[PDB]
Amino acid sequence: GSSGSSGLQCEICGFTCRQKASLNWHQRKHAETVAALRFPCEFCGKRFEKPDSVAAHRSKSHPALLLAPQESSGPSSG
Ligand SMILES: [Zn+2]
Ligand SMILES: [Zn+2]
């Protein structure tokens, strides 16, 4: 077959599709879905319909930030 790109990857949710159309058709919905999410991610900027999901996301996508950083301390707000 043809070697090169494997498949497209969405940034909104993180889906993957082979055909370009799919992505577009899969994004058109995001434009309306964005409304649902009310609690944004102060870590990356994402958004969720609720905080419960925003807190866990940081443990799956930002699981390397929550933990103590390198020797060099930093300003933590809590
Ligand atoms: Zn998506
Ligand atoms: Zn995030």
Side-chain angles (χ1 to χ4, degrees):
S2 274
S3 292
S5 272
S6 280
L8 304 154
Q9 187 89 46
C10 158
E11 66 180 82
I12 309 303
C13 60
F15 195 67
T16 35
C17 70
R18 283 77 202 202
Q19 283 292 60
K20 196 75 75 75
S22 299
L23 205 60
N24 287 277
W25 191 290
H26 150 83
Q27 287 203 351
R28 82 194 275 274
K29 57 160 144 198
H30 278 330
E32 68 153 87
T33 309
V34 296
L37 320 326
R38 323 93 181 273
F39 314 75
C41 193
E42 68 290 329
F43 266 98
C44 59
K46 272 184 71 170
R47 299 166 151 90
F48 301 61
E49 45 149 282
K50 28 173 211 291
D52 209 297
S53 210
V54 148
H57 153 67
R58 301 150 57 164
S59 285
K60 304 270 150 87
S61 208
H62 299 294
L65 301 168
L66 308 151
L67 275 171
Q70 64 291 333
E71 61 288 334
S72 294
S73 204
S76 73
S77 276

